[PDB]
């Protein structure tokens, strides 16, 4: 006996969920438009039921806000609407956190209950390269201490406060650095998705996940993520690495075989250990774990018992 | 702005609040049953409203479980009813956690949504004195490592799993040790309250506060808790210390003056440092912070915005 309800591919797919849960052609066009060669069959058979389950929790939290406001005879110091409902998205580099997150942002905005949905990545809260250097942490980008934890906690707290205005900094992956002067403004959305390696990480004191209303961990066999990491790396030889401004131009194209080999070594030396030491242990902390098989198709969902 | 809604005493009192909330006389009689000279005016004027607020969260969770079971077309692997709703209660030694906990236990069982409310203290998860010897930890009794944290995690996990049967050990304060062979059995309650110094403490992997649905922190100025710790040590001269089976039986023989000196020492040397290091840093992780005046009456509630 476990604290999770477990579903295989078959039962999950088996949309007994008696909304004829099917997207329209307008929407499917829109969803192509996040093109990580996105498989619209998974969006409709898997991510749509998931947006639905999460929808039930957001709507529940919204009536609990109403009932509670009514009970407290709605006094001045109580807010006028619910604060943003915050979803955390965690997993290894290259498992597809960002794609999952973008898809949920899109699906969840479909309901009139919560149409304004924001997405922030914790990437924006890494220390600038210059600062990482000052601390001797360059070889540790994406490990817990390479993030300005205070700023990230201030950011999320302010969002949970129901501020009209919360600012995050912006990270360019192209430049391998924080963009000086850039800011993403978040203005009391109904939902805010927060995606990052570290979102479910444990801290001595108050931590970001203490402000999450729901959380998701994207999982896969460690070997399978290695393969996805390697492939994205070779593929980047065009798209990004090719660009002159790319911090990683000194790789831009140096033999497929030698790119495989370097990718494997960056994986084994940085990203894989960050996974074992720091990310995987946060897995049992998620409300929902999604396990994908070799070709990114979901084969197992574990959902915390309500 | 902050993540908290704040009430002072008068505001909380003002139960012109959308429902009449008064206790009946059979209720007030029952509530005297634990009447360590319980202030029954506070019980009806502060704790009743507090239990109502919590009830709203319990009932929300019950509906969400049903809306969710129906969306999932109710599978064999989803449980038939909600699993226990778990409330944590934390704060210093002598701050009145146990009283607080016992007053919400009886009050919450008032509603037919959730009549079966249990109470467990984490004291039952301290290592027995003998195992605490092997480890050189007798001087750290009540510090995070004096607990069998693995068994405490297993116990709370098993309850959140909806199992019919979960056993906690039993601590005797009289004998200053775990009673060998004795067990408290928990059998799928609607609500389980978990009271302890350590309930909201952080750790690297999964931690018990992950499995909570609501949590309370009982608060006061450190001066005042010292005053209550001291008063209770003196008072115990007559009561528990007087028992000849009392592990602290030699404390019965203490003059007032000697008792003040000794109590003041145990405090400023063991309990006060535990408060400052391990217990007080957990205060912002609570859903609700109850602050008490020197006289034991509540004077601030801080509640997390919904
Ligand atoms: C460790 C570093 N981490 C990140 O850049 C990073 C840091 C924080 C969040 C995400 C990421 C990212 F997804 F991009 F991997 C990394 N992990 N992979 C690389 S290569 C440049 C980015 O390339 C890829 C390749 C595949 C991929 F799936 C995502 C990004 N780096 C930069 C780097 C290369 C060599 C070296 F010796 C030190 C660093
Ligand atoms: C630090 C210790 N803590 C625990 O026993 C303990 C451990 C876990 C939870 C609760 C408690 C308790 F509240 F009872 F204090 C303690 N704190 N107070 C004492 S004296 C016996 C219990 O007396 C009181 C006195 C006041 C009070 F509010 C609660 C308990 N001890 C045992 C002890 C005495 C002398 C010495 F040198 C070392 C230890």
Swiss-Prot record, chains A, B:
InterPro entries linked: P-loop_NTPase, PanK, PRK/URK
Record's catalysed reaction(s): (R)-pantothenate + ATP = (R)-4'-phosphopantothenate + ADP + H(+)
Cellular component GO terms held in the UniProt record: cytoplasm; plasma membrane
Its EC number(s): 2.7.1.33
Cited SUPFAM superfamilies: P-loop containing nucleoside triphosphate hydrolases (SSF52540)
Pathway of action: Cofactor biosynthesis; coenzyme A biosynthesis; CoA from (R)-pantothenate: step 1/5
CDD domains: PanK
Protein name: Pantothenate kinase
Organism: Mycobacterium tuberculosis (strain ATCC 25618 / H37Rv)
């Amino acid at each position: 006996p476990s604290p999770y309800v477990e579903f295989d591919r078959r039962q999950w797919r088996a949309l007994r969920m008696s909304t004829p849960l099917a997207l329209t052609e307008e929407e499917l066009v829109g969803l192509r438009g996040l093109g990580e060669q996105i498989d619209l069959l998974e969006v409709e058979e898997v991510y749509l039921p998931l947006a639905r389950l999460i929808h039930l929790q957001v709507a529940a939290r919204q009536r609990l806000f109403a009932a509670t406001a009514e009970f407290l005879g709605e006094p001045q110091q109580n807010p006028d609407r619910p604060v943003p409902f915050i979803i955390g998205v965690a997993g290894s580099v290259a498992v597809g956190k960002s794609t999952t997150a973008r898809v949920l942002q899109a699906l969840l905005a479909r309901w009139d209950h919560h149409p304004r949905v924001d997405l922030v990545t914790t990437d924006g809260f890494l220390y600038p390269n210059a600062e990482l250097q000052r601390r001797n942490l360059m070889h540790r980008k994406g490990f817990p201490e390479s993030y300005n934890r205070r700023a990230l906690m201030r950011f999320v707290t302010s969002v949970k406060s129901g501020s009209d205005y919360a600012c995050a900094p912006v990270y360019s992956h192209l430049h391998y650095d924080i963009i000086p002067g850039a800011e993403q403004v978040v203005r009391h959305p109904d939902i805010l998705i927060l995606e990052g390696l570290n979102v479910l990480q444990t801290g001595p004191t108050l931590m970001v996940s203490d402000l999450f209303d729901f959380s998701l961990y994207v999982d896969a066999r460690i070997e399978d993520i290695e393969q996805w990491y390697v492939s994205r790396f070779l593929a980047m030889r065009t798209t990004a690495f090719a660009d002159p401004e790319s911090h990683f131009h000194h790789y831009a194209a140096f033999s497929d075989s030698q790119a495989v080999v370097a990718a494997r070594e960056i994986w084994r030396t940085i990203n894989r250990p960050n996974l074992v030491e720091n990310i995987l242990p946060t897995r049992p902390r998620a409300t929902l774990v999604l396990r994908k098989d070799a070709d990114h198709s979901i084969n197992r969902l574990r959902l915390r018992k309500l």
